[PDB]
């Protein structure tokens, strides 16, 4: 499945080069601009525990998810990952626990020491 292909083939997009955030581009975006630190970002997403049978279904797929990039409003992996995405891009991210919920997790849905998998679609961004 996609987590194994991303662990196998994914690009390391970390500063540390610890393969803690691994990326495969699923749909090539528009042009060359990526969102910048402090921009509002608008995405759709699907997340799961990387071992997980199905994507989590507990958010509205219609409504864009919105956050301010690089401001610690999301797990570290998203501040890293989304910054790399072109408008219209769909990417896969495979994330080690130190770029997600670490030792604490976030019970019940996210256990301690959880590796996560996302599909993200970058819809738009604005300064
Ligand atoms: C700076 O560090 C953090 C900042 C914010 C948080 C709160 C959780 C945060 O969730 C996320 O960052 C990620 C990525 C953005 C989409 C939602 N996130 C999820 O982890 C998913 C998760 C993926 C694994 C499968 C189970 C679900 N969570 C969600 O999809 C749900 C709907 C379950 N969830 C509670 C939220 O999306 C709550 O809304 C958020 C809004 C902003 C940031 C976070 C969550 C946690 C942080 O560190 C642990």
Numbering used by the authors: 13 to 139
Give the article text.
A typical example is the family of FK506‐binding proteins (FKBPs) that possess a highly conserved binding pocket but have diverged to perform diverse biological functions.
As intended, the interactions of the pipecolate, the A‐ and B‐rings, as well as the cyclohexyl group with FKBP51 were completely conserved in comparison to previous FKBP51‐SAFit co‐crystal structures. Strikingly, we observed that the carbonyl group of 13 a, 13 d and 13 h displaced D68 and replaced it as a hydrogen bond acceptor for the ϵ‐hydroxy group of Y57. The rearrangement of the β3b strand is stabilized by an inward flip of H71, which partially replaces S70 and substitutes the former as a hydrogen bond donor for the backbone carbonyl of Y57. Intriguingly, H71 is replaced in FKBP12 and FKBP12.6 by an arginine (R40 in FKBP12/12.6 numbering), which can be expected to be less efficient in stabilizing the 13 a‐binding conformation, providing a molecular rationale for the discrimination vs. FKBP12/12.6 observed for the macrocycles. Representative macrocyclic compounds 13 c, 13 e and 13 h as well as SAFit1 and ‐2 all dose‐dependently competed with a fluorescent NanoBRET tracer inside cells. Compound 13 d as well as compounds 13 c, 13 e, 13 h and 13 i all inhibited IKKα phosphorylation, similar to SAFit1 and SAFit2 [4f]. For 13 c, 13 d and 13 h, the apparent maximal inhibition was already reached at the lowest tested concentration of 1 μm, possibly reflecting the higher affinities and/or improved cell permeability of 13 c, 13 d and 13 h compared to 13 e and 13 i.
